[PDB]
Amino acid sequence: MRECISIHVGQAGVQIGNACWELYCLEHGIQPDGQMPSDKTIGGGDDSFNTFFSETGAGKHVPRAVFVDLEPTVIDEVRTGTYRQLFHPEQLITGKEDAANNYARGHYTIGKEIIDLVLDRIRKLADQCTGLQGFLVFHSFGGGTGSGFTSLLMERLSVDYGKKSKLEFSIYPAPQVSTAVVEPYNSILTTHTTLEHSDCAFMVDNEAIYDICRRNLDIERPTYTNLNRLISQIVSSITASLRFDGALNVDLTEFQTNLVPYPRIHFPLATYAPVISAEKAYHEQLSVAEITNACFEPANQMVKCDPRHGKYMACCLLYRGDVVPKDVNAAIATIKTKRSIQFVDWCPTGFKVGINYQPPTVVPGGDLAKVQRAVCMLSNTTAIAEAWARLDHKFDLMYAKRAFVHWYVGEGMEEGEFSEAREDMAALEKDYEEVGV
Amino acid sequence: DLGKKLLEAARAGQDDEVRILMANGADVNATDASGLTPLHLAATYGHLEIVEVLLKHGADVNAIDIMGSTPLHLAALIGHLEIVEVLLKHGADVNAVDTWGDTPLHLAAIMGHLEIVEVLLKHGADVNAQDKFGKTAFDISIDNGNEDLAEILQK
Amino acid sequence: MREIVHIQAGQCGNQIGAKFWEVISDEHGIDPTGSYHGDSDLQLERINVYYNEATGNKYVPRAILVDLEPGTMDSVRSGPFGQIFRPDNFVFGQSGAGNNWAKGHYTEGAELVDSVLDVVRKESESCDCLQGFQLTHSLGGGTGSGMGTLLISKIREEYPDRIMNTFSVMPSPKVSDTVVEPYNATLSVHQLVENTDETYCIDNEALYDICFRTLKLTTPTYGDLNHLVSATMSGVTTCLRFPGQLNADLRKLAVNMVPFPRLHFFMPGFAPLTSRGSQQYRALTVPELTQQMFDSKNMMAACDPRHGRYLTVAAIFRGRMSMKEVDEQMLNVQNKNSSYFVEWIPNNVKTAVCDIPPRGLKMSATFIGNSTAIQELFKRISEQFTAMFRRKAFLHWYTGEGMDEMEFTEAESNMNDLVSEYQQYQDATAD
C-alpha cells in the first residue's frame, strides 16, 4: 500500500475533484461523514483503498486530497456541500483575489502569496504516509490559477519530492464553454513549464466531453455539472487500479512504464464505453466485443483527434464488470485483424489487459445508466498531436499581433517566455512526427 | 497708441470705449502681431454692437490676418449667426479662402452650425469649394456621417 | 474582487450618475431609504459590489459626488435617491469650472482634489477586496473633464493595482453648441488613453440621433438622453451585479476586452430602444435581439461598426430565454458578419445570459464592443479641435490658467496616433 495525494487547483480542478471524491466514496462504500461499515480494521489499515483515504481513530476515512484556489467562491461550495464533513478543513485553501485568467498572476504575482502555505499543508499529508508514491494534480489549461499556479506548484513539488511521481488531469479548453480569449496563451505557457515536471498527463478535451453529452446523453445544452459527472466517471476508471486489487497499473510508476515510452510524449489518450443515457434504463446490454470496438471510434475519446491518422505506441484496456477474460482475447484478436490499427515498428504490438470484476457505480442524479460491463482504454498514440496543433495555431494567430501580451508582461513576466514556450511546443510536435513514420 | 487699446476694447466688448477711441483718431483698421483687426476680435467674441459700429466707421469687412482669416471665417467658426448676417449685409466675401483652403461654409459645417450653413448657402456659398485636402462641405458631412448637415446641403 | 468605488464628477457626471443609482437600486429591490424590498434572493448575492451595508438592513451606495459647481449639489438631493447618498461623500467647491478644462485640471479643481482623495481613502479601506473605481463624467465640460482626469491620475498613483473604469460622454453640437468642447474632450482623451483600463464611450451625437430619428422625439431633452445612458449603464454592469462566470469582475472583463493597452475605448449598444414611453412594447425574439444589437442605429457611439472590425465583443442577454437558442444566434451573426471580425483573435465573442431582465422589459440585449470603427468618433472630435486650434480661437482661456500651448499639440498628436492605431489593426490580416 503506497499512498497517493490528490491536488485540485482552480475552479475546474476543484469541481472535478469534488465529483471524483463523491464517486470514490460510492465505489468504496464510504458514507458522506467518512464512516465505512465494511472496513474491518478500525483506526488504520493496509488495504488498496488506503492509498486514497487515510483513517482517523474514530473510524473516519479522510481523503488524501488538497483543494487550492486563489478565490473562495468555488471551494466554499465544498465546505457546505454534501461531503462537507469528509475533507480536512485545513486542506481547503483559498485566497481572496484570483488570477483573472492570467498565467502571470497565478505563477508570478498573486500565486506566490500562498504557494508556501500550500506546500506546508501538502507536507502535513505527506508526513502521514508510510510510503508516498506521488501526486495526482487536477487543473485546467485556460484558467489563470489552473495554468499559472499549477506550473508553480509542480516546480516546487519536484524539489521537495524529486523521486515521487506526478500525474496530471488537465482540462483542454473548448470554445463552447470558454470563459477567456487568452486561454490558448495560458495553455501553451503551462505546458512548457510543466513538461519536465510531469511524468504523465491525461488531457480532457471539454469539446469532446461536450459532444458526448449531447449525442450519447441527449443533453441539449450541457453544463459543467453534466461534464464533471462524465469526467469523474473516466477518472475513476483510470485510478481504479490504484484503489483496488489488480494486475495492471498498480502504482504510479507502472503508468509511465506502460504508457510513456519517452518522457516528453507523456499525454495518453483515454476512451470510455459505453456511455448510455439514464433515460434508457432497459437498454440492451452490450457485449465485450461491442464495447471494445467502441474504444476505437473517434466519437468516444476524451480528446478530439483521429487515431486512424496516427500510430500506437502503447494500449491498455481496463475492464469493469461482467467480463470473462476469454471474451477479451477473442475481441482483441478480431480487432488486430479487422481494423487497420498500426503500431510503431519499435513497440511490441500487444495490448495490456486488466479486469475489475465489479460493475461501474453510477452517481444518483447523474445522466448515466447502469451497465453490466464497461471499458476504459488508455493508449499513447501520435494522433493526439492534432490537439496541440489546434492550440498552437490559435496561439500563433494572436501572438503575431502581440495581442493581450501586455497583460502578461505587466504581471512580472518577460515577453521572451512566450517564444520560448512556443518553440518548446514546436519541438513537441516534431517528437510526434519523428515517431509516426 | 490707440490702436492697441481699440483692439483690446473690441475683444472685451467695451462699447463706450470703442466709440471714444474712434473719436480721438484710433485706427479702426489697426492690426495686432497676427494681423487681426478690431473687427476680427469683435466678430470672434460675439460683440454684435461693436461689429456694426466698426463697419459704420471704415472697417474693412474683408480684412485678412496672417493665416488669411476674414471676420466671416471666425464668425462662422465660433457660431455667431447675428454677426454672420451683419457681415454679409456689409459686403463680406462669402467664399473667402484662408491659408488652409477653408471657406466660411467649411468652418460652419465642421462645427455643426446648421443655421449658419443655411444662411451662407442663401448668399452664394460655393458647395464645390475644396480645402487644402480636397474636401468640400458635402464631403465633410459624408465623412463625419452628419445626416442633418447633408440634407441642408441639398436644396 | 468585490467592492467598486463609484465616483461622479461635474454636472453631467452627477446627472447620469444619479440616474444610474436610481435604475440599479430598482433592480436590486432597494427603496430610496435603503431597505431591501426585493422578492428574489439573486438581488443580494452580489450587492456588496456597489453598496455598503449600514444599520438596520440599510444599504448605502458606495458613491462619491464631486463638482466644482455647488448648484448641482442640491440638485441631487432634490432627486429621488437624494438622501441615500452618504452626506460625507459630497465634495463641492465654490464656483463652477466655466467649461474650462484648465480650471478643473490645474487651478480650481486642483485645490478640491485633495478633499476628494480623503473620501476615496475612507471608502477604499472599508472594502474587503476592492476591484477598482468607476467614474461618470463628460469630456466637453470643465469639471468632469478637467478635474475628472486629474482625479484619475491621483487615484491611479495610489491604487495602481486596481482597475480604472470610466463612463465618458462625448460632446456634440446637436446637444451643446459650445465651441470649446472639442478642446476639453481632446485634452481629456489624451488623459484617458494613459490612465484608464476601460472607457465606455457614450456619444451625445448618437443619443440625439436615436431620440430624434429612431425614437421620433422632435426636441430631445437631457432626460431623454440620460434614459438611454442609464439603460446602457445597467446592461454593461449586469455581469458585475449578479452571479455569473463570464466577465464577473472588472479585471476579467479587461483581460478579455482590451488586446492592446491604448485601445480600451468600448462601443456600447442596447436593444430594444425605449423612449421613456414604452407603453406596451412587445418582447423581441432572440434572433431579433441579436440582429438589432449589432445594428448601427443601436450603438451609443456615432459609429458604423460595418466600417471597421470587431477586436473583441461581449454580449449580455437579460431575461427568460433559451440558452441553446442564444448560442445558435450568436454563432449565426458571426458567420453572416464574418468579415466584420478580426481573424487573428479566435473566439473573440463572449456571451452571458442573465435571468433577471431590467425594469419594464422582458427581453433585453446589451452590447459591449471593442471595434476599430470607433476611430470615426475620434476623427470627428479631431477635425473640430483642429478647426478651432488652427485659428487659436479662445486659446487664452487655457493659457491664462498655467497651460502651455504645447499640451494642445500633444493631445492632438496623441489622439491622431490613436486613430492610426485603430486603422493599423483594421487593415491587418492573418496572412
Ligand SMILES: Nc1nc2c(ncn2[C@@H]2O[C@H](COP(=O)(O)OP(=O)(O)OP(=O)(O)O)[C@@H](O)[C@H]2O)c(=O)[nH]1
Ligand atoms: N469540465 C470542466 N471544465 C471547467 C470547469 N470549470 C472551469 N472549467 C474550464 O476551465 C477553463 C477556465 O479555467 P478556470 O478553472 O475556470 O479558472 P481558474 O483555474 O479558477 O483560474 P482563475 O483565472 O484565477 O479563475 C475554462 O475553459 C472552462 O471551460 C468545470 O467545472 N468542469
Ligand SMILES: Nc1nc2c(ncn2[C@@H]2O[C@H](COP(=O)(O)OP(=O)(O)O)[C@@H](O)[C@H]2O)c(=O)[nH]1
Ligand atoms: N447625456 C448627457 N449629457 C450631458 C448632461 N449634462 C451635460 N452633458 C454634456 O456635457 C457637456 C457639458 O459638460 P458639463 O458636465 O455640463 O460641465 P462640467 O460641470 O464642467 O462637467 C455638454 O457637451 C453636454 O452635452 C446630461 O445630463 N446628459
Ligand SMILES: [Ca+2]
Ligand atoms: Ca482500516
Ligand SMILES: [Mg+2]
Ligand atoms: Mg477561478
